[PDB]
Design a protein around this ligand. Structure first.
Ligand code: K
Ligand code: K
Lengths: 983, 983
């Protein structure tokens, strides 16, 4: 019955969507984009009277009349979802509608949403019109509100809106009065629009973005279209065109384009839809992600007497974006799209501050991302100004996702066209003059059909200079870019070798970054970096969508689906957390991998004797003469043998060779590493000149027989093997025990999020009972200084998981060799997570030192990043707080590892080749069992894992699982570890 | 054992307490006091790593070493008590120590606080030294932290501090390094200092005020003493003296005193404790609360080459403060101290923003308060800058209150002298140059003894130009002002008529403003305004100390003692809420009374025929020629008969007569009101020219027989009396019922907070069972159009509370007269709350209109404020949300009241003299029962009360209960109401 139950009720009395035309005070203000400090702007953000009900019948219907008294109401902060200020229920669900549930007495039935279970938040505040605004036109702007609202000013109805992610505006000039004014919005949690707002995110309510007033003369700048292109022959001369829509009602409109040095470079004047003259800048400064060169465009209306009545403006970037000869190109250069999807998220909900937005782009740039896709809705206006300013390509996207709904698709019901086209026009209008926006996207998981054909058609008709994509379009005409998402390496290869294609393969979403993830990233990039027509894609995604809480003991933790509300509250668990960073922008390990693979200066060692390196310049518009190579050779002892700085010139996409020189490795050193690091000669305000923007390490075998790390005999070793399990049950040094538990064979790791979906993952492990192993002795032979045990490896059901031979040999050294031979019964063991030994030490042994890949967590299918070296750390520092606790803390390519107390007591452990290890504060049982961070408890011991083999992590939570070279072999295998007690 | 278990461990390595000597960039910065934007200042506020334990043994001891890893810790906002960010437990107790309780396994035992139950919050963050600070001296400043902390920088111990309300500072210059610095504070909830921090407030923890760094040259301004007095002969020539302490190590120190027009008026130069020359300003601009005239003092160190190396400064106010001929005088004029006590409080705890502080002083000034007492601790530095700027006298007070502890007093244990004198020096040093500070106070509920004798002695030795008071001193020498608090009108009169006294009586705390309160305020002021030597006092207090929460249905409410923690958590209930405003600075009714009695222009009607008024000018330094009188005569119909503006000259403290002129009242009008209102000719930035700063109304009897409000016969009335109760059980108008319940006699009101302590209050009422009354018919006589019932009034125990005669008479009018005669059995009924009728109407009758004192809640002993007039309102608007729900909504001096639906249906009710009424959304049972606002539920009806008599509210929660003229008489009484149905 009411408006928010209709898919047509998308607005009433709003202004036509347009570009932001904030009136500024001063051309100098226009260059800074500093419009909020304008005398013609007034925020309505702040504290507002607020009221909440479940059931629109029980609401205070008359709260919008100035006479209705709201003094006994609470305040609520605006902007900010009300779920994060103590009201109602935050719900996370995924491919479903949270309201399509029994808790709400409703089955989904578009365009209808629940009625009696629907929620109303009534907002009201008062305000004074600034004195200086006398006789001016005043516009009310609400930057975004979810889901549907009525709005009143002074008790006069303005109208209503659906569409939560772009501004709605009303001209409220004739509704204002003297003295105290009031403003009211009545906000519904659900309307028909929610069916198009079924994004993979928190389902939240209320006023999400700024609410404000701005004021213009009776005659104003209503809109304007900026064209700043390059000629398509050499891409060197700028093309400048400008149209200005003047609204209302002798006078002139004039523009001035100025360069970074405030010098005027183009300028026009006319005495309503004014079309200025086409103009040309030769040898113009061009815009792109690496050199975001900008101009400032000032637009002024003038009195019949030549006085300035209004000034507005925007940054201008001369640049082109196109699909050329089937490849996506910026300024005539086909580029690799190294990007990420970004959702808007903070502890306040959908509401993101300027500092958090700046944090976002600062970290992105620091980790070699060059493009961002706006996860299924346009973003806060300020995000685009950041991208123009610091250089990111934006793939902007209409707020349209009806995942919850083939033949019943909302893409094919023409009665939803008005909603679709409204959402699309609004996305286009507000951002059309940003150079940072390179691609328009039509929506997300909303199906294909006539609605997206009209959307595509319309968009193409007004936009000639940006590609338009749509992922659900697949190969149909209505998409300019083949977006297909989460495809496997093979599927990309099936595509690019076809001869009847004309569109680049660019992954809209790929490499699902959920929990301990982003395995197989190297393999994707071997393809992109070699296929002229798979140009990369956008990682899913940037930031975990989580909320930090604190339990009754002061233990903090991350929340996700099911965590707020009653017991059977709709919920898709932790699947909203998929980020390269945690919710407060602290990076996850896998993000360091992304910085490594996304780097723009890649190198190989081409000649070991001269140390000659081939350097490939993956930049699109930067010469390597902007950077400085630092190189150095270092021995396993941590002694720099040769170091230098170097300066190479090399053009984008070109390669270049560089000889470093032979370097004499001593005979006492066992191996050496050649490290290459690159930094910039000039800072940006985001990256200083000490920040390592690309690196590479290469292993140099040397002649030493022993690790300069090997300790010397440190007293008298004893040990004991268990009659029953065959496990090493004791190891002393002059009587002092070193083990807090026996050494046994482990085959299992507490599931990562991926492990839980992986075809070869924890589903198999837990079902074979690998997380519950015991050893039984079949035969045990002992001498004074050695032992050989043949054991059965059983799960808790008693089933034999495999056969093993455990060989303990005390060396004349005092070191103990442990050589293990294991073979799983591959008749019913289809997978193992790892192959190695595990044991506990008392938690005083927290000084961990190792020679291995570091300083951060790496896995065999995620370890291009990091550098082999000597590193100091602790089990507390190694444990990474993934939203659900899972395996963490792995080190790869390990030569040796030490665990010691501060007193110096401990052991130094080596193998016969590079191994993997971890050492964590929490046991495996506990870590597997914990569902939230605060569930973790310490038991006085650390758990050490020594692995000959452990699986990669892959990305199975969505898309490819661990690739085959990274699975753990099931053949008979033998691996050995040698423990050297120390003092 | 550890430092915080000792009362001597008050600091280590701190700088000597001093005045704030922030280095500014610019003399222009110095005038604005804008030091936070200085290049030599850097905030450390923001997000910090945080960790919390119960039990100092279980804490992360090494968190202060740069090597200790805190990446898996949460963040916490600084500043702000941690209890308000999800940690530990907020506790409110009063004259007790929260730790002296069984929950904490501890009995109070100074100087020891609990050990295993004590709480540790470890805070750490990193920071970069600004580049420009190379070679500069750097100071760390923590403006306040509760209770005891250790602090480290870069792993170097700085020292520790006790004393939560003034800054601690360390010179950290040699502890800084290149790159990332770290800072650590380890904060304890309790130390020995807590025994002196037993204020009536929330017991809270952590970093409460700003933490920051400032930077000076090796040679700096360490301190300085400003003297700006007036000659004690005419108080017209300014006396200026300045001492500057220069620390560290050719150079000159120079000052310039400048007036509001940046013109230099005094200035010196010298080539370390520099004493400048005594100087004199004739006809200087003088400082006081009404005209806070200021000068700006700039102090500059200069190079041997005359270059500026450091600039600092402060505002200067030429003014004197003294006890002259036994009276407190500002600038030779004895003033009335109209003030309030202020605690620091927001939703963050003890932490108060600039906007909230400005809100505080803005409302205070708007309600004619001229002085503020700092409730038992010095305040945030910025508070003093507000008082200098806008004009408030400050009574500043050392952070010393050991209420929890006669002969065992901490005032008499000399081992606590170091704590006492430390707390006192610190209060003195930081504020000595503020003109707004007029009185120093020694502490609060801490007893008298040798410690306060040394404190008093010391203070007197360094301070010659401000009185020093101490409330627990009583009449002993160590107090310059007789502060005795909460004394009755009589006790003040016993004092001021003594001839052996030499000290003014100034109430340190009086008129406890808890719940529905501030009764008897007129009577206090009749005394102050007539006793040259009782000069007023400070209301307790300014702001409720409450926290707003939201329950599971979106119902907000205020919290108080017992509301956080387990069940038997220490608690003194709602006694922390005693304010003239609620916690978010919305005023309580009683605050409008304070504006009325504190007003500075008081008037009486001296001649009714000419309308001649006597005007008394209670200002101390303002002529009435700064104001504008608006006057007007108005008839009970709401028709202005005469109005005008007037301009009078009258000197402070002098009186003046003013004839308004005779005015002809029509013969149709029954009474007229003469309203006088005053406004200022010139705005301050706090009070515009439309704000009514003082008013007065006078009643003018006229000849009309009827209220121009009386309706005309509106159809056919019927009614019904109950066979059993004698109650009016029905009243219809053409068949339509008007009552939702019977009309019965009420004697009780849901207890106010005062009612619950009052000698004549709810203790008596509830014990006589007055809240549970029934009527039983003794005899009932009926005719067609009238009824007479003799009833017994019984409590629920069946005991006869009194006898009543109920007389119902239907008038030829259709109006029903109800005449009630009641007499309580004064053998065991010692008190009644009111005498009147009560009944319910369905809640559609929400349109209330009345001719009475309004627009706000008044009681017979709190009704000097407001104006009789015609007012529109609703039961929802009438209900005031006192922290615990209690009686509210009373109107006094009522001629008639109407209750109608929007359709216009209802009744118009009059009496035979002024009565009282209320009409509320919640029943009395429910209102009495509710302990928190969200407990209140609506039942579909409003409760109307028509009172012939109701008690005052008094101030018994602390101090005098309802005064005798305001008690409800227990004699036989007869009162009548006439109900006129309307359509
Ligand atoms: K887990
Ligand atoms: K109550």
């Amino acid at each position: 019955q009411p408006e928010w139950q209709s898919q047509y009720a998308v607005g009433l009395n709003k202004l036509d969507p347009h570009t932001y035309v904030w009136p500024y005070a001063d051309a100098s203000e226009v260059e800074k984009g500093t419009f909020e400090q304008s005398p013609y702007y007034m925020s309505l953000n702040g504290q507002w009277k607020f009221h909440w009900v479940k059931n629109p019948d029980t609401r205070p219907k008359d709260f919008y009349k100035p006479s209705y008294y709201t003094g006994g109401w609470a305040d609520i902060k605006v902007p900010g979802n009300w779920e994060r200020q103590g009201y109602g229920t935050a719900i996370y669900v995924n491919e479903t509608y949270e309201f399509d549930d029994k808790m709400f007495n409703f089955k989904k039935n578009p365009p209808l949403v629940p009625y009696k279970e629907n929620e109303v938040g009534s907002y009201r505040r008062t305000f004074k019109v600034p004195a200086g605004w006398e006789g001016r036109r005043v516009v009310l702007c609400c930057e975004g509100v979810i889901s549907f609202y009525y709005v009143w000013v002074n008790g006069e109805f303005l109208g209503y809106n659906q569409g939560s992610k772009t501004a709605a505006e009303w001209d409220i000039t004739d509704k204002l009065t003297d003295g105290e004014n009031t403003i009211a919005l009545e906000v519904y949690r659900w309307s028909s629009g929610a069916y198009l707002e079924c994004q993979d995110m928190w389902r939240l309510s209320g006023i999400e973005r700024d609410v404000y007033l701005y004021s213009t003369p009776e005659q104003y700048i209503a809109d304007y279209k900026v064209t700043s292109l390059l000629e398509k022959e050499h891409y060197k001369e700028g093309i400048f065109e400008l149209e200005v829509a003047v609204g209302g009602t002798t006078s002139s409109i004039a523009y001035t384009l100025k360069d970074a040095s405030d010098k005027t470079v183009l300028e026009g004047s006319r005495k309503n839809l004014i079309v200025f003259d086409e103009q040309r800048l030769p040898d113009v400064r061009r815009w792109n992600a690496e050199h975001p060169e900008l101009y400032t465009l000032l637009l002024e209306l003038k009195d019949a007497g030549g006085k300035v009545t209004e000034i507005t403006g925007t940054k201008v970037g001369f640049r082109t974006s196109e699909i050329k000869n089937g490849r996506f190109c910026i300024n005539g250069v086909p580029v690799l799209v190294k990007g990420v999807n970004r959702h808007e998220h903070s502890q306040l909900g959908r509401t993101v501050s300027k500092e958090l937005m700046e944090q976002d782009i600062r970290l992105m740039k620091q980790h070699n991302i060059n493009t961002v896709r706006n996860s299924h809705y346009p973003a806060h206006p300020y995000w685009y100004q950041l991208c123009d300013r610091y250089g990111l390509y934006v793939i902007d996207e209409a707020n349209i996702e009806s995942h919850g709904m083939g033949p019943a698709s909302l893409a094919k019901d023409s009665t939803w066209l008005p909603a679709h086209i409204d959402r699309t026009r609004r996305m286009y209008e507000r951002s059309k003059n940003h150079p940072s926006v390179v691609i328009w996207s039509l929506g997300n998981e909303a199906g294909n059909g006539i609605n997206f054909e009209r959307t595509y058609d319309w968009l193409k008709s007004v936009e000639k200079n940006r590609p338009v994509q749509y992922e659900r379009a697949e190969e149909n005409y209505n998409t300019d870019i083949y977006c297909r998402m989460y495809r496997s390496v093979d599927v990309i290869r099936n595509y690019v070798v076809r001869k009847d294609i004309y569109r680049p393969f660019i992954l809209c979403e790929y490499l699902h970054a959920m929990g301990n993830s982003c395995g197989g990233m190297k393999e994707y990039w071997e393809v992109f970096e070699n296929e002229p027509m798979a140009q990369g894609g956008c990682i899913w995604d940037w930031v975990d969508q989580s909320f930090r809480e604190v339990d009754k003991d002061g233990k903090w933790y991350w929340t996700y689906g099911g965590d707020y509300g009653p017991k059977d509250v709709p919920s898709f668990g932790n699947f909203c957390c998929n980020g390269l960073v945690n919710a407060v922008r602290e990076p996850h390990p896998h993000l360091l991998e992304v910085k490594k693979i996304y780097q723009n200066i890649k190198s190989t060692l081409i000649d070991k004797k001269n140390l000659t390196v081939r350097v490939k310049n993956w930049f699109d518009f930067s010469d390597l003469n902007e950077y400085i190579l630092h190189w150095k050779v270092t021995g396993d002892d941590g002694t720099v043998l040769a170091e230098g700085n170097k300066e190479v010139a090399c053009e984008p996409h070109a390669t270049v060779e560089l000889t470093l020189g032979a370097v004499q490795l001593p005979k006492t050193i066992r191996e050496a590493y050649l490290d290459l690091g690159w930094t910039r000669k000039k800072s940006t305000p985001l990256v200083d000149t000490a920040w390592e923007i690309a690196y590479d390490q290469f292993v140099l075998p040397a002649s030493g027989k022993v690790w300069n790390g090997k300790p010397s005999e440190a007293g008298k070793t004893t040990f004991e093997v268990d009659e029953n399990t065959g496990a090493l049950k004791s190891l002393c040094l002059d009587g002092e025990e070193l083990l807090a538990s026996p050494v046994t064979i482990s085959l299992f790791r507490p599931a990562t999020d991926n492990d839980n979906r992986d075809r070869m993952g924890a589903k198999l492990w837990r079902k074979a009972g690998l997380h519950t192993l015991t050893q039984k002795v079949v035969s045990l032979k002992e001498s004074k200084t050695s032992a050989t045990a043949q054991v059965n490896i059983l799960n808790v059901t008693g089933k034999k998981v495999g056969d093993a031979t455990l060989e303990y040999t005390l060396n004349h050294n005092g070191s103990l060799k442990v050589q293990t031979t294991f073979q799983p019964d591959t008749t019913w063991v289809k997978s193992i997570a790892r192959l190695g030994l595990t044991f506990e030490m008392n938690d005083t042994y927290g000084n961990v030192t190792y020679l291995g890949r570091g300083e951060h967590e790496t896995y065999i299918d995620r370890n291009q990043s990091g550098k082999i070296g000597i590193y100091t750390t602790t089990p507390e520092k190694m444990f990474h707080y993934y939203v659900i606790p899972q395996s963490t803390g792995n080190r790869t390519d390990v030569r040796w590892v030490k665990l010691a107390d501060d007193s110096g007591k401990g052991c130094w452990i080596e193998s016969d080749s590079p191994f993997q290890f971890s050492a964590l504060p929490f046991s495996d049982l506990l870590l597997e069992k914990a569902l939230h961070i605060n569930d973790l408890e310490r038991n006085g011991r650390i758990t050490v894992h020594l692995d000959a083999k452990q699986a990669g992590v892959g990305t199975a939570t969505c898309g490819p699982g661990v690739l085959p070279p990274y699975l753990v072999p099931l053949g008979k295998q033998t691996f050995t570890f040698t423990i050297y007690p120390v003092k």
